[PDB]
Design a protein around this ligand. Sequence first.
Ligand SMILES: CC(=N)N1CCC(Oc2ccc3[nH]c(C)[n+](Cc4ccc5ccc(C(=N)N)cc5c4)c3c2)CC1
Ligand SMILES: [Ca+2]
Ligand SMILES: [Ca+2]
Length: 223
Amino acid sequence: IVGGYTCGANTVPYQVSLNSGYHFCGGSLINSQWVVSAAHCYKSGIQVRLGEDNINVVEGNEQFISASKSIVHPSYNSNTLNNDIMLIKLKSAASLNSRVASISLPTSCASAGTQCLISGWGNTKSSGTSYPDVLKCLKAPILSDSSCKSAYPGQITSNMFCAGYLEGGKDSCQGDSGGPVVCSGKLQGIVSWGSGCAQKNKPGVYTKVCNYVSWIKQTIASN
Ligand SMILES: CC(=N)N1CCC(Oc2ccc3[nH]c(C)[n+](Cc4ccc5ccc(C(=N)N)cc5c4)c3c2)CC1
Ligand SMILES: [Ca+2]
Ligand SMILES: [Ca+2]
């Protein structure tokens, strides 16, 4: 996250770190046994880390659980990143508390101009590299579809939306991938892609969760 702030330990209770010997992607807890993340974060041997603040310090509120199953969307296209969403089932149920909570799925899509909260442990530099140890947060509005498509001609599908600031300076970045975009208390996006981070006229691109609710609910119920 570039131009964001330190969230504060366990202020984003649904945020999860995906670890395979190190942090590689974020994710969201949707219930005691399932996490939603980006299909492009798929890896074999994932461990889910919950209630995390500093990813390099064990502060006592963490729950580390291995994944039993990973399901990438049936129509995920790695070339275009269309349908960039995957579900992860935990080996055992997480214990929910003040610092580990699930986020609700939306009952409808969000309007452009709606303010959202994006979070992660990704790079904090526009052009350079600096990875934080603590969770970073960022408030950003959903951009109009025309602004999104103008920034990335021929690359935006109906399963994507843009959020941020056209003037640059504030955005999600690499390391944030699979992380939550919460608007009006519902999970509306997953950190997917972009061009650089916080560059002018190149806002972040997110998977549009409101289009996958029925697939998420049907998949979870049969697995
Ligand atoms: C051809 C086509 N439809 N596309 C070109 C390729 C693809 O964009 C990609 C695809 C694969 C990538 N692999 C990597 C490492 N990047 C850079 C990458 C990855 C994730 C980001 C998340 C947020 C942001 C952000 N600026 N908020 C930038 C990112 C940049 C990537 C960016 C999706 C769109
Ligand atoms: Ca801390
Ligand atoms: Ca920790």
